[PDB]
Amino acid sequence: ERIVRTLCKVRGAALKLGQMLSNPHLAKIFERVRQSADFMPLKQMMKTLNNDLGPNWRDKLEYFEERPFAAASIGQVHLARMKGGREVAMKIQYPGVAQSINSDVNNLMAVLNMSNMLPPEHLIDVLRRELALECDYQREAACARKFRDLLKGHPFFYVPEIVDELCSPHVLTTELVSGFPLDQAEGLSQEIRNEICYNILVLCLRELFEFHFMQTDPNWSNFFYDPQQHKVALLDFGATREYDRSFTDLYIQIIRAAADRDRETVRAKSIEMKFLTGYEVKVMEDAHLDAILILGEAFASDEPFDFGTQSTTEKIHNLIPVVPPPEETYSLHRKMGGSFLICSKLKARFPCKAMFEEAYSNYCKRQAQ
Ligand SMILES: COc1cc(Nc2ccnc3cc(C#N)ccc23)cc(OC)c1OC
Ligand code: NA
Ligand code: NA
Numbered sequence: 001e002r003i004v005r006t007l008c009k010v011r012g013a014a015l016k017l018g019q020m021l022s023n024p025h026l027a028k029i030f031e032r033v034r035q036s037a038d039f040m041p042l043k044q045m046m047k048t049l050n051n052d053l054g055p056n057w058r059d060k061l062e063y064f065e066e067r068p069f070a071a072a073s074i075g076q077v078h079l080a081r082m083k084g085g086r087e088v089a090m091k092i093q094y095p096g097v098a099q100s101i102n103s104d105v106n107n108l109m110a111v112l113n114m115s116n117m118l119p120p121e122h123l124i125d126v127l128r129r130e131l132a133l134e135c136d137y138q139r140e141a142a143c144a145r146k147f148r149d150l151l152k153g154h155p156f157f158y159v160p161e162i163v164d165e166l167c168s169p170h171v172l173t174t175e176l177v178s179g180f181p182l183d184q185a186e187g188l189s190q191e192i193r194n195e196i197c198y199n200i201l202v203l204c205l206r207e208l209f210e211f212h213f214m215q216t217d218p219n220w221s222n223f224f225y226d227p228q229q230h231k232v233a234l235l236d237f238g239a240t241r242e243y244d245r246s247f248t249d250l251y252i253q254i255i256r257a258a259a260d261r262d263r264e265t266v267r268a269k270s271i272e273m274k275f276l277t278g279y280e281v282k283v284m285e286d287a288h289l290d291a292i293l294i295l296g297e298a299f300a301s302d303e304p305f306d307f308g309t310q311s312t313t314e315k316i317h318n319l320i321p322v323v324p325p326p327e328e329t330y331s332l333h334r335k336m337g338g339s340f341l342i343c344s345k346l347k348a349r350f351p352c353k354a355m356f357e358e359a360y361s362n363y364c365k366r367q368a369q
Pocket of ligand 1: 089091175177178179235236
């Protein structure tokens with residue numbers, strides 16, 4: 001009834017679990033853990049700052065906010081202001097969180113099993129593995145720099161600059177952004193939500209097929225909408241992957257076949273990419289190909305697509321159906337599906353044929369060249 005309380009002790013691992021799971025009470029549990037004011041004591045955060053930035057770290061700042069704005073899976077964000085006035089956000093890891101992951105995961109699963117809340121061991125290792133990748137804040141900083149360079153001059157999106165002097169293996173600092181995360185934007189008007197989600201799906205297509213450099217686990221909590229500028233700050237860099245153009249090219253042939261309602265080509269190309277073995281049980285394979293074709297439905301229609309009902313987690317969870325499998329077996333579906341799910345959670349509606357034809361057209365222009 002109040003597993004929430006004991007889960008708040010491992011709220012980081014529970015959050016990561018909920019982002020993978022997307023019984024009904026368990027969602028309410030996770031939603032309450034997420035919405036909990038329970039945060040890691042300041043004293044533990046100070047140890048990371050001292051270890052990483054030196055005992056004099058506070059001298060670099062005029063202000064350090066002791067209550068975090070929000071907690072991540074392995075750290076929390078504290079707002080602050082540098083000497084001179086430059087406002088920043090400082091994402092700070094829990095001390096030795098890397099060595100606490102296995103215990104935190106075991107604790108989370110124990111609480112969920114003993115409470116009879118969870119009716120797969122290999123997926124638990126996926127949880128451990130994903131939390132460990134999140135610990136690499138040096139890499140995350142490098143991905144933020146590269147995305148900022150790729151999106152230079154965009155009229156809608158921006159990436160806050162990294163503050164190198166406040167970055168370390170366990171601390172990532174950016175300039176402050178003015179706005180709020182998209183998990184608080186459900187109450188915005190339909191036109192605004194449509195415009196946000198349109199731009200997000202276009203960027204998804206550019207990340208996959210143009211940049212070959214992409215965030216593969218989209219989370220609406222990591223996009224910030226600035227209502228005044230009418231812009232979105234991108235802070236979602238945790239699972240960023242670069243792929244060879246030959247790999248995303250095969251993926252665009254899948255989406256092309258799904259848009260064209262060519263179920264057999266979707267299946268053949270899926271086998272070629274090693275997403276399917278070719279001898280899966282047909283019932284599961286069919287449900288998986290059904291979810292792909294839902295993606296094609298959107299990209300095949302000049303009429304507005306109703307993400308709120310047509311691409312809900314119910315209709316698209318088979319994009320990735322239940323030793324863990326290689327990440328390259330599902331990262332692109334997780335990206336496409338995750339982007340559709342953001343459109344669905346914000347109840348967006350807009351036509352998608354134009355944006356896919358532009359992406360596919362660029363693909364064809366290069367193919368002839
Ligand atoms: C999701 O990932 C991150 C999120 C943040 N959050 C923020 C950044 C910049 N301004 C903010 C303003 C407010 C306000 N009011 C709240 C949060 C902000 C910071 C990060 O790094 C330092 C992240 O890690 C890449
Ligand atoms: Na984290
Ligand atoms: Na840059």
